[PDB]
Amino acid sequence: MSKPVKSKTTGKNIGYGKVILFGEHFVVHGAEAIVAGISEYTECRLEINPGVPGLQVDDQRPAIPGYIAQKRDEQIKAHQLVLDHLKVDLSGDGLKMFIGGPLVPSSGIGASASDVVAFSRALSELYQLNLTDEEVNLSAFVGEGGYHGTPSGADNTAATYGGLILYRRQNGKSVFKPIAFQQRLYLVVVGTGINASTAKVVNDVHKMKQQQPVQFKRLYDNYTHIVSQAREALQKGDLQRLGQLMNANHDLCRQIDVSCRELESIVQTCRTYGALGAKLSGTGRGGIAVALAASSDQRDAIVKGLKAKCPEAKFIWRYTVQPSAA
Numbered sequence: 001m002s003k004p005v006k007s008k009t010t011g012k013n014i015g016y017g018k019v020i021l022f023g024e025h026f027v028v029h030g031a032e033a034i035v036a037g038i039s040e041y042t043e044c045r046l047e048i049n050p051g052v053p054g055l056q057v058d059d060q061r062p063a064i065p066g067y068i069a070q071k072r073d074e075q076i077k078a079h080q081l082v083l084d085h086l087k088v089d090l091s092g093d094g095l096k097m098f099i100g101g102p103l104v105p106s107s108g109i110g111a112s113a114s115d116v117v118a119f120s121r122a123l124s125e126l127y128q129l130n131l132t133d134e135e136v137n138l139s140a141f142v143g144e145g146g147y148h149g150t151p152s153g154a155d156n157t158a159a160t161y162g163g164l165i166l167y168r169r170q171n172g173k174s175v176f177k178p179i180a181f182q183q184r185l186y187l188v189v190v191g192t193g194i195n196a197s198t199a200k201v202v203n204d205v206h207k208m209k210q211q212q213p214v215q216f217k218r219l220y221d222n223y224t225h226i227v228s229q230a231r232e233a234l235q236k237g238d239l240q241r242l243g244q245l246m247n248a249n250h251d252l253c254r255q256i257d258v259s260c261r262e263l264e265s266i267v268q269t270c271r272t273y274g275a276l277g278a279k280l281s282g283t284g285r286g287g288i289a290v291a292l293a294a295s296s297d298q299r300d301a302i303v304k305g306l307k308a309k310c311p312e313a314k315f316i317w318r319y320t321v322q323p324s325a326a
């Protein structure tokens with residue numbers, strides 16, 4: 001059982017946000033996915049709470065209205081899973097937790113993973129556990145079990161490592177590797193305000209494949225071609241090509257029936273206002289859409305356009321993926 005070495009964290013213990021750039025839904029069936037850990041993050045600060053047992057959560061994340069209250073019971077389970085995993089006993093002296101960072105918690109942004117990653121790093125500091133990224137990622141994965149469900153590993157992996165990540169089901173579980181990229185990704189991420197059930201939509205897609213094996217196989221193959229090109233576009237640093245491929249990916253997502261009217265409105269407006277590419281991101285049928293801008297100034301025009309002309313764009317965020325290398 002781990003005992004606290006520090007009385008208060010002084011580090012910057014964070015978990016990155018996440019957007020799926022390519023391959024939501026198709027990844028379930030063996031295709032390669034591109035997941036982006038964004039710069040924007042959740043921070044966890046910890047300090048000892050002498051004589052006061054348990055974990056006191058001071059959650060001040062800039063979450064969308066109602067989100068924190070909705071997710072609190074899951075968060076309780078999640079934090080306790082991390083605490084148990086790391087063998088931390090708070091039955092005597094507990095902990096005060098402060099949760100901050102600029103990441104806006106909302107469905108589709110991997111905010112729950114960001115939370116448990118930040119918490120795992122903060123615990124590692126306070127208890128001087130010297131956790132590797134691998135160990136942080138596992139702690140987060142375990143904790144993610146407290147939210148529903150089930151975690152693929154993509155959210156926690158993006159939250160602990162950051163940057164661009166190749167995600168595939170291989171031999172025969174989730175396999176992750178970093179993607180090297182030399183350019184900044186200027187993203188507009190848009191929340192619909194609608195929460196969809198990952199499990200239901202995935203199972204609906206499973207049923208579509210069952211009902212139309214030949215048609216689904218074609219869409220699946222069409223996807224593998226897009227992500228193959230997406231990888232090359234990334235290696236080249238051709239953002240215009242990447243954007244075009246994002247659009248093509250969205251088209252395939254509509255064909256497996258994971259879009260909706262609100263998402264269509266957002267992507268249409270994004271493209272109208274000069275986005276290189278725009279698509280739903282993640283589960284679909286609600287959640288977030290993601291648009292790629294060529295620059296920061298061109299991102300301004302898209303945000304302007306969405307605010308003015310797209311009422312379905314309930315929440316609008318400027319997110320960035322920092323380059324991995326010089």
Ligand SMILES: C[C@@](O)(CCO)CC(=O)[O-]
Nearest residue numbers: 024025027152198282283
């Ligand atoms: C729909 C899906 O591809 C992404 C949901 O965030 C499911 C998964 O990858 O486990």
